[PDB]
Amino acid sequence: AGLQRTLVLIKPDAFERSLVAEIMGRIEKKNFKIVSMKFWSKAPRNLIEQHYKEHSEQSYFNDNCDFMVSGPIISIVYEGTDAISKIRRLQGNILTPGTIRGDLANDIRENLIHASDSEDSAVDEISIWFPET
Amino acid sequence: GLQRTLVLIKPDAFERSLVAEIMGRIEKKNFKIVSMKFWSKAPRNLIEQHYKEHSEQSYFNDNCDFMVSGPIISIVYEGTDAISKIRRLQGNILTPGTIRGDLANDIRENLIHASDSEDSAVDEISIWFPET
Amino acid sequence: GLQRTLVLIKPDAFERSLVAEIMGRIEKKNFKIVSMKFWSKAPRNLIEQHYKEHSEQSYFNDNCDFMVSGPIISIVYEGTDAISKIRRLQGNILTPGTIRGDLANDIRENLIHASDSEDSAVDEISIWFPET
Amino acid sequence: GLQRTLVLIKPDAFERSLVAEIMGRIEKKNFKIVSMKFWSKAPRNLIEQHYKEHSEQSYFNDNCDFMVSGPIISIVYEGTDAISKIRRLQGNILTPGTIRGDLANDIRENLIHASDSEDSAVDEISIWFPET
Amino acid sequence: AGLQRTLVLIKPDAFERSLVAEIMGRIEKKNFKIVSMKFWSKAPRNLIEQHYKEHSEQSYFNDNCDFMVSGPIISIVYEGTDAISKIRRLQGNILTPGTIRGDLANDIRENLIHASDSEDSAVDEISIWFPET
Amino acid sequence: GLQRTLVLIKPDAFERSLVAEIMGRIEKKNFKIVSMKFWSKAPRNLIEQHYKEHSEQSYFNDNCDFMVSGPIISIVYEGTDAISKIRRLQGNILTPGTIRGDLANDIRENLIHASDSEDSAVDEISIWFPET
Numbered sequence: 077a078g079l080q081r082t083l084v085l086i087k088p089d090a091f092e093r094s095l096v097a098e099i100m101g102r103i104e105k106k107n108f109k110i111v112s113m114k115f116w117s118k119a120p121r122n123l124i125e126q127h128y129k130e131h132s133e134q135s136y137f138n139d140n141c142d143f144m145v146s147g148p149i150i151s152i153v154y155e156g157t158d159a160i161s162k163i164r165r166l167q168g169n170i171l172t173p174g175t176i177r178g179d180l181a182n183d184i185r186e187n188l189i190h191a192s193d194s195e196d197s198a199v200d201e202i203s204i205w206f207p208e209t
Numbered sequence: 210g211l212q213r214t215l216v217l218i219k220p221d222a223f224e225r226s227l228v229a230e231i232m233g234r235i236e237k238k239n240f241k242i243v244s245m246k247f248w249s250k251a252p253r254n255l256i257e258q259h260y261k262e263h264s265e266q267s268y269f270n271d272n273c274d275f276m277v278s279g280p281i282i283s284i285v286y287e288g289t290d291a292i293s294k295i296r297r298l299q300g301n302i303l304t305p306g307t308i309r310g311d312l313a314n315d316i317r318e319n320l321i322h323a324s325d326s327e328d329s330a331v332d333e334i335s336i337w338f339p340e341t
Numbered sequence: 342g343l344q345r346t347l348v349l350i351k352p353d354a355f356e357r358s359l360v361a362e363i364m365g366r367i368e369k370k371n372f373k374i375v376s377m378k379f380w381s382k383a384p385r386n387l388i389e390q391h392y393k394e395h396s397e398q399s400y401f402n403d404n405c406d407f408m409v410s411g412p413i414i415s416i417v418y419e420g421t422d423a424i425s426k427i428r429r430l431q432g433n434i435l436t437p438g439t440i441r442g443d444l445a446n447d448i449r450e451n452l453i454h455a456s457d458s459e460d461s462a463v464d465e466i467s468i469w470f471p472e473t
Numbered sequence: 474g475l476q477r478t479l480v481l482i483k484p485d486a487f488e489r490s491l492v493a494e495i496m497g498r499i500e501k502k503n504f505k506i507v508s509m510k511f512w513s514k515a516p517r518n519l520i521e522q523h524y525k526e527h528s529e530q531s532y533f534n535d536n537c538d539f540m541v542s543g544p545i546i547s548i549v550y551e552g553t554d555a556i557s558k559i560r561r562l563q564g565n566i567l568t569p570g571t572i573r574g575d576l577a578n579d580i581r582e583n584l585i586h587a588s589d590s591e592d593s594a595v596d597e598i599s600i601w602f603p604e605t
Numbered sequence: 606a607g608l609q610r611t612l613v614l615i616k617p618d619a620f621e622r623s624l625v626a627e628i629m630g631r632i633e634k635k636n637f638k639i640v641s642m643k644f645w646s647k648a649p650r651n652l653i654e655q656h657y658k659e660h661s662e663q664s665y666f667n668d669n670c671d672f673m674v675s676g677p678i679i680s681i682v683y684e685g686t687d688a689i690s691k692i693r694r695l696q697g698n699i700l701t702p703g704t705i706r707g708d709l710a711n712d713i714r715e716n717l718i719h720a721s722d723s724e725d726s727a728v729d730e731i732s733i734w735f736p737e738t
Numbered sequence: 739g740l741q742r743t744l745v746l747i748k749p750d751a752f753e754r755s756l757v758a759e760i761m762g763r764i765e766k767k768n769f770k771i772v773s774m775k776f777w778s779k780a781p782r783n784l785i786e787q788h789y790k791e792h793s794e795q796s797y798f799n800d801n802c803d804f805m806v807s808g809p810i811i812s813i814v815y816e817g818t819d820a821i822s823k824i825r826r827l828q829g830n831i832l833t834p835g836t837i838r839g840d841l842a843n844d845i846r847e848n849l850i851h852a853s854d855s856e857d858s859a860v861d862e863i864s865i866w867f868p869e870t
């Protein structure tokens with residue numbers, strides 16, 4: 077059908093601020109289903125760097141990796157109609173109220189959640205976190 | 210400008226237990242219930258009249274089938290700028306913050322209907338609440 | 342044991358915009374709506390029949406007055422052990438966790454009524470939904 | 474980096490019991506309370522100062538009367554980009570997802586005030602918390 | 606009528622955990638109204654010790670005062686029918702789900718909220734926090 | 739002081755979309771996740787081990803079939819007095835305020851499992867997370 081899969085990361089600030097269920101709940105409410113899920117008490121920097129490889133040239137690259145390994149993260153593969161972009165809109169940004177980041181986050185770095193932004197990004201990110209493909 | 214508008218709560222809302230969730234969003238925006246009917250299964254005729262403008266579209270029959278595949282609630286809501294405001298509340302499955310934006314992800318199963326103009330509002334209210 | 346029970350949503354619920362809140366608590370416990378009527382103002386007779394057992398109590402008339410001071414919704418709910426479970430959901434204004442426990446604080450204005458026995462449930466359903 | 478901004482919770486929030494709902498939205502966005510005062514009734518000259526840029530408008534007097542019709546809370550919030558972020562949270566009655574977009578439907582009774590610039594922020598904070 | 610007033614403290618853990626609105630919301634929802642309210646970025650130990658004077662002989666007395674001045678608190682005077690005990694039940698305890706402490710707290714000391722437990726306690730506590738009687 | 743306890747989120751939670759709702763209640767009580775696994779379908783021998791004390795009961799096989807009818811999540815939670823506090827959170831279908839009391843109404847489809855003793859806790863954690 078229009079069925080898709082996408083990769084979401086719940087970031088360490090979410091655990092810090094006790095917002096894990098709140099975030100997963102918003103995705104659950106829009107009728108997306110968990111296909112795979114993995115809890116990392118601390119992610120290997122290796123995985124983080126791969127995941128953010130497209131960002132390796134940026135000023136914020138290392139500070140961001142630092143944060144991403146500063147506490148637990150959950151990686152989830154979601155599935156549903158048009159999953160990649162719909163879950164991207166749910167994530168939104170810190171400027172737009174009504175989205176996850178819009179309602180709950182206020183920082184350029186500590187922003188609670190990652191979602192794949194394209195078909196190619198999803199395929200690649202899912203592979204990084206669930207290599208057992 | 211105080212108006213009235215017609216809302217339908219669709220069978221997917223009952224299936225997924227989103228009924229009160231949906232009504233609550235409209236209630237919290239301060240719109241009031243003027244009349245309301247619960248249909249365990251809506252008469253197919255009523256659904257056909259309701260969606261008449263669409264009779265030529267390819268989705269007409271499938272949509273009718275779905276609209277009759279479970280209960281629905283028909284509600285007349287009152288309030289300032291009600292037709293326009295409740296339409297925004299309804300929203301669409303793309304933009305978060307709305308009923309459809311937060312809770313739906315289908316082109317057919319989208320939880321709620323709301324009139325979109327003064328004319329369709331008058332018409333739909335007469336279809337579901339002829340007692341006027 | 343699958344049962345049906347009668348619920349009234351009282352005028353204070355409309356006044357304080359707690360309608361969907363109340364219905365949502367029953368919906369989330371997995372009870373289903375079997376029938377439902379919205380009354381902009383309930384006929385005083387219906388209210389008198391409904392509260393007959395209380396006709397001799399000092400609060401009878403004041404209570405009737407309140408019950409007619411705004412809209413109410415009459416609902417028939419279905420589900421396993423529905424009469425007993427929805428009574429617990431209704432609760433009382435003392436113990437938190439229930440509808441009254443969380444949302445009410447009056448001996449008269451207490452948001453919701455729920456049948457309390459198999460007999461009163463049958464009776465009340467006939468008062469509000471005679472079509473049987 | 475850090476900014477501070479002035480928020481007013483308006484009397485319609487108390488009347489409609491939405492005070493915690495509004496404060497909660499700003500809290501969930503990680504803004505912190507620096508100062509706060511509850512006014513069972515705000516002195517009229519504070520209200521008039523606060524809206525002084527509006528002194529020539531037709532709605533001026535009526536809005537002041539409304540603002541003095543019940544309790545208000547004045548809060549200084551602190552956080553990154555506080556002024557603009559809280560402005561967007563307030564939003565407007567046409568924009569679902571925001572405070573006014575979800576809970577308000579009036580030109581005047583719109584639940585919340587938030588400063589809209591650095592200068593207005595600085596000035597408004599000194600009106601409500603002149604002890605600084 | 607049956608009208609009463611009672612004193613509530615929102616404790617420093619509430620600000621720490623971002624649960625201030627959540628707590629005040631539960632009281633607001635049961636139809637109690639704020640009569641006076643005061644924000645303390647940090648309360649004078651003097652006030653805390655008075656407030657907990659009946660506890661001056663206990664092992665936990667000083668550790669508790671320590672915590673009560675470890676961050677902001679809000680003191681509120683609420684009003685409504687039977688306010689003292691109804692708001693006491695709302696507060697509940699860490700063992701009873703459905704109450705504030707029952708749903709949200711898990712510690713003998715860091716327990717989010719105080720509510721007066723009698724007519725005499727209320728009168729005295731209100732006097733401590735809003736001396737302007 | 740600290741304890742750890744085993745929680746199972748049952749297939750009815752996935753079917754009814756209450757997974758976040760349940761995890762949220764335990765999160766709001768300040769319990770932390772130590773370990774967690776999602777099982778699209780749990781191997782039947784894990785389920786049977788997990789319920790082994792129940793092997794002679796009449797409901798044994800049927801309950802196992804239910805537990806394998808959809809996804810489940812196994813979580814190790816850590817916090818002060820975790821075992822007993824999470825047990826009370828789970829509660830039962832007769833007790834409003836708890837997970838089962840608010841959201842469940844069945845003898846078997848009751849949303850959540852939580853360990854009920856130190857020994858059962860230790861044993862159940864080793865069934866679902868034997869890597870320790």
Ligand SMILES: O=c1ccn([C@H]2C[C@H](O)[C@@H](COP(=O)(O)OP(=O)(O)O)O2)c(=O)[nH]1
Nearest residue numbers: 131136139140184185186187189190191193
């Ligand atoms: O100035 C920045 C920009 C981004 N990031 C982090 C947060 C962000 O989530 C991630 C990827 O950056 P992006 O693609 O700009 O944001 P998004 O995650 O919204 O795609 O890098 C920073 O730490 N600082």
Ligand SMILES: O=c1ccn([C@H]2C[C@H](O)[C@@H](COP(=O)(O)OP(=O)(O)O)O2)c(=O)[nH]1
Nearest residue numbers: 263268269271272316317318319322323325
């Ligand atoms: O391709 C489609 C388009 C629409 N519909 C249904 C869903 C929609 O709610 C109804 C009316 O369609 P619309 O007027 O395009 O949508 P709306 O209800 O958003 O005005 O028809 C379909 O089943 N398939």
Ligand SMILES: O=c1ccn([C@H]2C[C@H](O)[C@@H](COP(=O)(O)OP(=O)(O)O)O2)c(=O)[nH]1
Nearest residue numbers: 395400401403404448449450451454455457
């Ligand atoms: O002193 C009273 C007692 C009761 N009632 C009203 C509220 C109540 O909902 C209704 C029926 O009374 P009940 O059977 O004692 O309460 P419940 O509805 O909890 O069974 O009468 C009063 O107005 N005053």
Ligand SMILES: O=c1ccn([C@H]2C[C@H](O)[C@@H](COP(=O)(O)OP(=O)(O)O)O2)c(=O)[nH]1
Nearest residue numbers: 527532535536580581582583585586587589
């Ligand atoms: O026609 C109007 C316009 C505004 N106001 C009130 C409500 C508003 O909150 C306040 C200030 O007006 P504004 O700056 O236009 O609105 P905002 O508060 O969104 O900046 O004056 C009215 O009563 N009538």
Ligand SMILES: O=c1ccn([C@H]2C[C@H](O)[C@@H](COP(=O)(O)OP(=O)(O)O)O2)c(=O)[nH]1
Nearest residue numbers: 660665668669713714715716718719720722
């Ligand atoms: O062992 C204890 C007991 C109490 N307290 C603190 C928390 C409590 O809120 C306050 C007053 O004690 P209480 O009267 O036993 O509890 P409550 O506040 O529930 O009345 O003292 C502790 O720090 N440790």
Ligand SMILES: O=c1ccn([C@H]2C[C@H](O)[C@@H](COP(=O)(O)OP(=O)(O)O)O2)c(=O)[nH]1
Nearest residue numbers: 792797800801845846847848850851852854
């Ligand atoms: O008659 C029964 C009793 C129990 N069970 C299932 C549901 C229950 O969660 C599990 C274990 O039973 P229990 O220990 O009595 O319930 P709990 O999980 O509350 O300890 O077995 C049934 O299917 N039928």
Ligand SMILES: [Mg+2]
Nearest residue numbers: 191192193197
């Ligand atoms: Mg990106």
Ligand SMILES: [Mg+2]
Nearest residue numbers: 262323324325
């Ligand atoms: Mg249309």
Ligand SMILES: [Mg+2]
Nearest residue numbers: 394455456457
């Ligand atoms: Mg009775």
Ligand SMILES: [Mg+2]
Nearest residue numbers: 587588589593
């Ligand atoms: Mg302005």
Ligand SMILES: [Mg+2]
Nearest residue numbers: 720721722726
């Ligand atoms: Mg005490």
Ligand SMILES: [Mg+2]
Nearest residue numbers: 852853854858
């Ligand atoms: Mg057991």
